[model samples]
Target: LLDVQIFKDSPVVGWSGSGMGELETIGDTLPVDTTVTYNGLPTLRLNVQTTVGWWISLLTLRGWNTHDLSQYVENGYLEFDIKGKEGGEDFVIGFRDKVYERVYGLEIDVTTVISNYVTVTTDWQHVKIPLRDLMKINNGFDPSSVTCLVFSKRYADPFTVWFSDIKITSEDN
Candidate 1:
């Protein structure tokens, strides 16, 4: 059940018309793509399920910025960002709806930020924010029924990020 498919030469667009780029496939490393930009939003879609994992790295950190996962929680989604030169402690994972109802669903918000050239290895960072957690944060739809994954970027300057080997394995069976 492939919900969203992205590959090399995929057409990517941004909120400002300037954020247009392509997904590059490098060797047999992974069927993933790298996002390049300076100061704009870039979005991608994928399949959502109970278990999620991927290899990611922030190639350029140009001050405070944000990356949003908009495909998970129906009307709402999860977001992570840096406050400023101060960076942020822990990784933030949260959800929100159109009505302004929000919850820091699950947070590992530590008092630190990934500095430039620093590889924050989430090496297959497995994010398993349970249905109960979302229920506690915002209520409207069943968390178990989530089937889409979306992500966007908000940066102070142009930068790049690489995402690869994304997989959603079965947890029930």
Candidate 2:
């Protein structure tokens, strides 16, 4: 397939949060907001709360399942539209392959990738991270059996970000 849908009007399946060791403190509810959107459909309103003590909010998009994306490595990109509640929200985005019991996956820091890939904005911005580029950072990431699409807090600060139209597409898109 040339494209794979991750989140559109709703997430794929079995999407949930870990709260990153702060289950009671962080927001783990996946709210689908219909009021605001980048592409005229509902978007995921993710409210993340983290502190130096309670330092991470993590979501595993496919839960414990796996999907083969071996064909996408050459010219594929994970694309999405994102907007912050108050601007300057940040996170690490990546994919986890089902290799062993526990693997962290290949992560790309949103703030460091570009000046405005998905930051410093209350308005929506479209972002695309090339799969080949991600492979450059972590060559061991086997795209053939990806288990999760991970989003974790990049800093010890509470923030909210609305996400829409998340999917895997060809570089031509």
lDDT of each: 0.26, 0.63
Best by TM-score: 2
**Residue 114 displacement in candidate 2 (angstroms):** 7.6
Per-candidate TM vs. native?
Answer: 0.28, 0.74
| lDDT for each residue of candidate 1 in 19-55, tens digit (9 for 90 to 100) | 2222222231122223531124332222111122232
> Runs in model 1 with CA error above 4 Å?
1-136, 144-147, 154-157
Q: What is the lDDT of residue 3 in candidate 1?
A: 21
RMSD of 1: 14.3
RMSD of each: 14.3, 4.4
Q: What's the true lDDT of residue 142 in model 1? A: 31
Give stretches of model 2 more than 4 Å off: 18-29, 50-63, 100-116, 171-173
What is the Cα-based lDDT of residue 43 in candidate 2?
Answer: 85
Judge candidate 1 at residue 172 and give its lDDT: 27
